[PDB]
Each structure stands twice: as structure tokens, then as C-alpha cells.
């Protein structure tokens, strides 16, 4: 991916995070678990539903379009009519296939950027109260109980509070 996160420094995905597209896995003395990140999953679902609606709205429905009949003395306009019908089909087929190919690439890069944005948000929060251990994990220098973990996932982690409590 263009942003190095998905299939990048975060080596793989989580079948155990079921409530969203991006999120957290935590691990402290009380226990472990997954939790989707609602705010960022929501923003992506906004954009992707918008993307799909955009594709729909641009392909107005085809109304009644039947063929025509020609005599054995009208083959030039018969072939012209065939040329027109075939031509437009070749063009909408190209348009349809190309749009989906290009939008598919952008959609995947979009998800990749969203994961990277989330990781950097947490990194910016924890600063040097935790060790960046690669694979997208932060190892805390202080005890981080469930309330501590919950505050990281809310974006209201308290870097001054824990900077004095390092192990």
C-alpha cells in the first residue's frame, strides 16, 4: 500500500476485531482484547458509502432502446446503425471497467492511509512514555490499567500523569 501500513509494518489483519475496520488490541495485567476505533471507522464508512453512491448516480438507467429493421437495399444505413450501437457499448464498457479499476486502487490506498493516521495519532499521544516496538505496538513504561488503556483509545491520554510513574 502507498502508506506502508496495511501489509506493511503492521504485518497482517485481525479476524478477532469484529466491530469495525481499524482499532486496537491491548494487553495488561487485567486481561486483553480487541476494540474497534469508532470515530475513524465511521469516517471511512462515510466516504466509501459516498463513493459507491457516486458510482451509482453517474450511471443513469437505460430506458427503452430497441433495434431497427432494414431492407436488402439499405445495408449502408443498416451497418451505420450497427456501428453506432456497437460503438457506444464499447465506450460504456470501457468507462465502467476503468472506473472500477481506478476506484479499487484508491479505495485500498484510502484504508492504508486511515490505518497510518491512527497509528501516528497514538504515537503522538504516548510520546516517550512508551516504546515503539514495531509491528504497530507500543510497550508502556508505566503500568497502564484498563482506565489508562481506555483513555488512550479516547484520545485523552494523560502524558504528564504517567511521566512520573514510569517503572
Amino acid at each position, epitope marked *: 500500500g502507498l502508506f506502508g501500513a496495511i501489509a506493511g509494518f503492521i504485518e497482517g489483519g485481525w479476524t478477532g476485531m469484529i466491530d469495525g475496520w481499524y482499532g486496537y488490541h491491548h494487553q495488561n495485567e487485567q486481561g486483553s482484547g480487541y476494540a474497534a476505533d*469508532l470515530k475513524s*471507522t*465511521q469516517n471511512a464508512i462515510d466516504g466509501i*458509502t*459516498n463513493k459507491v*453512491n457516486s458510482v451509482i448516480e453517474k450511471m443513469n438507467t437505460q430506458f427503452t432502446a430497441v433495434g431497427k429493421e432494414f431492407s436488402h437495399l439499405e445495408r449502408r444505413i443498416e451497418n451505420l446503425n450497427k456501428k453506432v450501437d456497437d460503438g457506444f457499448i464499447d465506450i460504456w464498457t470501457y468507462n465502467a471497467e476503468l472506473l472500477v479499476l481506478l476506484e479499487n486502487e484508491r479505495t485500498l490506498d484510502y484504508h492504508d492511509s486511515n490505518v497510518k493516521t491512527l497509528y501516528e495519532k497514538v504515537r503522538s499521544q504516548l510520546k516517550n512514555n512508551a516504546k515503539e516496538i514495531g509491528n504497530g505496538c507500543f510497550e508502556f513504561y508505566h503500568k497502564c490499567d484498563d482506565t489508562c488503556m481506555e483513555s488512550v483509545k479516547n484520545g485523552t491520554y494523560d502524558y504528564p500523569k504517567y511521566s512520573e510513574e514510569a517503572k
Partner: antibody
Amino acid sequence: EVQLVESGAEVKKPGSSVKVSCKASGGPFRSYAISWVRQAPGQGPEWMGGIIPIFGTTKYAPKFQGRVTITADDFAGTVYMELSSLRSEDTAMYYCAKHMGYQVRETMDVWGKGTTVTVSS
Amino acid sequence: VLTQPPSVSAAPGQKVTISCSGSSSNIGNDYVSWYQQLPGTAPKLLIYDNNKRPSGIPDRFSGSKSGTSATLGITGLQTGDEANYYCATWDRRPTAYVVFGGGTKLTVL
């Protein structure tokens, strides 16, 4: 705003099943969940279950767990609710309501006008 | 389930309060919403996330949550405010689901 429009009224016999629908304006894909809530005469609302956009996952209340099936035709901007083994106690007004976001939750901010299902012998 | 008083009454211009009491599985660990219901019409959201109002709900409606009990408040009581009021929340009891209170009928004199 958003308009939720339920399908017509239904009158069905016990043990049969009914499939009501809820058509939403705009879209047709939505970024918010939709659930179904019913309310029997002289009673409070009771949630039945809901469905999540893109993921398509569903949650059902324990009381209807096992005989309710919520589905979505996102291209038609429509959501369906099928309830089976109908009892007389199922006679109520059925509403579809949307949630503020993509997860089903206690907060449903916009409701349809409701449709009635009558279950009698 | 959530328990509310079955019925409360007051004269116009007064302030009433509707209590919603649950357990640690519902109200004590999740947000609480309130709905108003008029005869013939669908439930109308008044309060979400314990104490926030949607657009269009007047200043005199308010909510709060203390530990295990939530509370709806209405001031400047009007004749049009005579309806059924329901609290709702996200119960983690058996399988998680949305649970409504029993309801509270508000009568104006």
C-alpha cells in the same frame, strides 16, 4: 431530513410469518445502522434487532433471537424484517428507526411512521 | 429491565422529573436516552448520551445520570407535554440488546 417508510399493514394467522420492509430516502447506501422496534397496545417499545452498513452484521434481542431475520438491499435503499412462528402476542405497531452512526445503539434519532401487524386466529 | 414510576402529574408552568432506575449491567455502565411519545405518533428522541439534546428539542428538556439512576427533567410544563416518556440504554445482560423502561405517563392539570 431522512424519510423512513414502512410497507403496508399485515394481518396473519398464528405460526405463519410476515416480511415487512422499510425504504429509506436518498443514498441508496447509508452510513448508519437501522433497527426495528415494535410496540404493543398499552406497552413500551421493545427493540427487535438491527443491521450495520457495509459489514452487514446483525444483532437481535434475546426475546426474538431465533425467529427474526434482518436483511438489507443497499442498492434499493431498503431493509427487511421477517418474523416467524407468529403468536397473538406479536400484534403491535412495527417501526424502523435509524441510528446516529453505524453501530446499533440505544439512540435512534429518526423513525418511520410505523405499520401494524395483527395476529389472530 | 429499567424501572420508572408508572405515572407523574403536575400543573402548567411547573418542573417535573422522571427517574429511570436500572442495574450495573445497563444504566450503571452505558449511556441513557429519552423518548417522548404522543398518541398516534412514533417515539421522538429528546435526550442522547445521558444529557445531550438533538436539534429541535427545547431548552426546558434535560437529562442526567447518577451512578445507576437516570433522570429526565422538564420545566415550563405545557399542555402539549402530556405524553408517555421512556428511557432506553444498552443492556449487556445475557445477549446485548437495547432495553426500554416501563414508561411513565405524564399528566398535566
